[PDB]
Scaffold this active site. Sequence first.
Site, short mmCIF file in Angstrom:
data_model
loop_
_atom_site.label_atom_id
_atom_site.label_comp_id
_atom_site.label_asym_id
_atom_site.label_seq_id
_atom_site.Cartn_x
_atom_site.Cartn_y
_atom_site.Cartn_z
N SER A 1 2.02 -2.34 -5.82
CA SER A 1 1.07 -1.44 -5.13
C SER A 1 1.25 -1.48 -3.62
O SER A 1 1.39 -2.53 -3.03
CB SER A 1 -0.39 -1.78 -5.45
OG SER A 1 -0.68 -1.61 -6.83
N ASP B 1 -5.52 7.10 -1.86
CA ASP B 1 -5.10 5.69 -1.95
C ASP B 1 -4.01 5.39 -0.93
O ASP B 1 -2.83 5.27 -1.26
CB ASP B 1 -4.56 5.41 -3.35
CG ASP B 1 -4.47 3.93 -3.68
OD1 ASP B 1 -4.89 3.07 -2.86
OD2 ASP B 1 -3.98 3.61 -4.78
#
Lengths: 242, 242, 242, 242
Positions: free
Chosen positions: C194, C91
């Site tokens: 995020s 990620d």
Amino acid sequence: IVGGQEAPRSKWPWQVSLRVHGPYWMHFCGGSLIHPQWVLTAAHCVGPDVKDLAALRVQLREQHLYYQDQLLPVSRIIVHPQFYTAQIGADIALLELEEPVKVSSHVHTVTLPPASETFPPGMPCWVTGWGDVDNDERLPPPFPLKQVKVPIMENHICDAKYHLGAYTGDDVRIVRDDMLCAGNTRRDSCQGDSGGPLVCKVNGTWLQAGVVSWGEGCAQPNRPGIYTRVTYYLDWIHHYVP
Amino acid sequence: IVGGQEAPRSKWPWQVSLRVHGPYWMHFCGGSLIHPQWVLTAAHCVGPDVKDLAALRVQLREQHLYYQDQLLPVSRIIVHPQFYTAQIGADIALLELEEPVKVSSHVHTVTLPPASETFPPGMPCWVTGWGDVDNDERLPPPFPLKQVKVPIMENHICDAKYHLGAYTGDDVRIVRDDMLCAGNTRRDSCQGDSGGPLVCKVNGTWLQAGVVSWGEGCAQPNRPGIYTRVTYYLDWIHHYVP
Amino acid sequence: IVGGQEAPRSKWPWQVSLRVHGPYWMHFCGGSLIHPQWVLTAAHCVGPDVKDLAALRVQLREQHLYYQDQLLPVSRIIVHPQFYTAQIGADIALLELEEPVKVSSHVHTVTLPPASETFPPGMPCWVTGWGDVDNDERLPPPFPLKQVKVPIMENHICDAKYHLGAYTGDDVRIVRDDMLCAGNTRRDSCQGDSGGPLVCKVNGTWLQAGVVSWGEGCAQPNRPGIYTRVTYYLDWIHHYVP
Amino acid sequence: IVGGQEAPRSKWPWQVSLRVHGPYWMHFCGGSLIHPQWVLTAAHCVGPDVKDLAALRVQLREQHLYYQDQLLPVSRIIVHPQFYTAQIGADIALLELEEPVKVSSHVHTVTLPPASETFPPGMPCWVTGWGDVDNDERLPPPFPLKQVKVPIMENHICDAKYHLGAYTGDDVRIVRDDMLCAGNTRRDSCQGDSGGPLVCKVNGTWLQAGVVSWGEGCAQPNRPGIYTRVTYYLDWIHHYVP
Ligand SMILES: CSc1sc(C(=O)N2CCC3(CC2)COc2ccc(CN)cc23)c2ccccc12
Ligand SMILES: CSc1sc(C(=O)N2CCC3(CC2)COc2ccc(CN)cc23)c2ccccc12
Ligand SMILES: CSc1sc(C(=O)N2CCC3(CC2)COc2ccc(CN)cc23)c2ccccc12
Ligand SMILES: CSc1sc(C(=O)N2CCC3(CC2)COc2ccc(CN)cc23)c2ccccc12
């Protein structure tokens, strides 16, 4: 404000924002400084139910909402006793600031109209606020004060418009004598602009002709914005403000 | 309906549901069968803005909403010409069905009050519908019809309740002569019950005293439910209904 | 950010905000400035589905979202090819600014950690961002960059905690080697954080240990925040970033 | 169910609805009756987090959600220990009913496939459920059970499709061997269909090929619906189900 644009920092020094206590001090209505200790607003912003003064704050002329808040406590809420809904009328109220205001160059009072001023169609008129920018669309961050020039329309011209597309009998007055109409399908005030100033330039002087009140949506065909006609309530206002 | 339970299958044969066209024919208001070809409802269900007949359907008494419908088209919509908002009054309308229904013991008309019935404080009164069961709480699936017994409150007594915790002058009346109060803090009608019947048993006859009209929230302290008083519009009604 | 505090204006000059084009240029993720022309963020912010560069902008360190916006276009979006979901891993993504940044004192790159650094428990670490202040609870206006000090937790222990109260077999690794854990039930990152930086103070210098990745809610019992372990993808990063 | 149509009353007697406790017993997932005392469903409907058996009930084949509910308690929930997310795989779970079911012609079991059945393209397959009828679009009341015939796809093709317009490396697997793809831009399962069955008619017998698991949206280009491949977990199932 539907249509129109972001306001220059110098204009509308009388514009105020009303805040309700929550997760943050949130804007819910506009207002205008009419006296260093008195704000004019819409009764439906603060009524008809009685509410806690502690829950309320006034923010004076700010270019963007929230960025540099200096919130101001309120000592009195005076709601016109004829008010129950905006459609019945008397949608007008007064807030007494706890202290008179530091009256500078960037913030100062708007001038009230003479009782004789009618504001006939064709007068240069502007409405300002931090409300939605169309039906169901919030003003985006950083929340700039917006302004729009709106065309005034006579109460009877306006009243007939409101009967277009309506079941309401022609003999039944929708737009009332204590009201005033302005705006079109491109220029208007909206949710969140409520209680804010409609000001017209008469012989070089800005006068508040109206307080933002209600309407059938915003900039809808044949549904001009409706304002509380300030002149109509001058006596009630002078009874309280110096 | 706030408080109260599912209505027995036999009760309330005159209840109906109004349906607007969309992804499905969604219930939006209640109403009542007063004649084999006419339905009584609230004006604010179908106004003041003018509606498209093609987008409206009537559904006669069902135990459960949406399970299975037999939607009935409407040929006329008569909104009282005096109506603009529920607070101003005249909250009343008539739907003419395109065809008369064939009445049974599971679906027949409700009897209108004599042209002068009073309905004193106390008195057996029931309101029914498929509306919310509390403030901002939808009736859950399978959407049973609900009933609740509500105490009538005399108009003057009720209007004074409505001034408690309000800014509105005691000389200004909120509950009008064409209106009627019922319900309390445990028992009341709510959103989506609008246009439905308030009925009372009088000498062994169910009479429709009111149409569910408006209120300040649902089952809120000192804010009883407000209904359009049927007796007040008997003449209007009879101009259209045999 | 859950817990912590508004960041001081002199901190985290490498924090950046990611904006997607809509009714306004809305914040959706953070990132960090690791080279004057490159920004480090999470893959799940901009993938796995390919997006249009035109609809994306980058905003450099701001104390209050949206207020002094100076949006910067990007010429390249590179997303680790091993990425499909945050739980599977990899990620991490890179954004090439179309133009290099004029490194100010209020704006400069953060240092990446040497391959050797594992960031043991006990290290002073912060995570910063403009995300939610709790589960389903937005950061209120005027959107101050927040910071929180977060306790690092060793992977094997973190991985085991993620099994508590779950059906998943103890033998199935939930927290991978390319991830890192930090935070507790008063200190955590959240939705909207995020892509932003987890930084630690090591031997006088700030190193970016982590990229905000995922978790089961925010500040939930036995569910610490998961970050992408920066050291794990140094080669990948250096393939693109000088 | 996207596309498709209401199911006949006599079709799919193994289809069940899963209900969570709340203001009502709300449908959240489908399942299927594979043994008189066992329901087959998706793990992501009940895990990875462990929850209160008391909060769950099962509804057997019924035409309209909620209308004549006879909710059945569950004694045991068994989720596959490899399950963490749908993308990782092992999205399969069994519910043990507290008491066995009285099978009939309107409710009976579906047959599990042999280990050797691949379900190649060209097989006649259906998915059933009360899920959304499109992206962000709830099944309207009275909530009929739906069905749709969906084309089966080979895995390698499904996997490659999912790489179309994605950053993910062509060699990184998205659709695993324990999954199975069916559907197009017109026919698909959706949110709320999860856990319910996908059945193919093989040699005159309906077999359950898959369990509604996941996908990128519903009926999106190059993103067919993805199902847990039932044959892959036959041994696991047979460990609990006689
Ligand atoms: C038939 S009377 C009637 S209109 C109306 C309506 O549509 N609203 C939507 C727009 C509102 C008024 C309320 C929202 O605040 C402002 C500000 C300016 C303007 C002028 N552009 C219009 C509005 C109602 C809402 C509830 C109850 C009866 C209502
Ligand atoms: C100050 S006048 C005023 S009250 C009011 C308000 O609180 N509403 C919420 C509950 C509503 C009326 C509207 C919703 O439908 C039904 C049905 C029955 C009852 C009787 N229990 C009450 C209601 C308004 C909403 C907009 C505009 C002016 C309004
Ligand atoms: C069991 S795997 C699993 S967890 C999870 C979950 O609860 N989300 C809610 C909180 C999210 C991750 C997603 C929202 O963005 C941030 C940022 C930081 C943190 C760390 N404080 C946590 C989060 C999912 C959401 C969809 C699909 C599988 C998911
Ligand atoms: C890149 S992996 C990825 S896709 C995806 C997504 O688009 N969802 C929306 C549609 C969902 C799966 C989840 C909702 O329930 C059903 C049922 C059937 C189908 C078959 N048509 C598809 C779905 C996610 C949501 C969170 C976390 C990672 C996710």
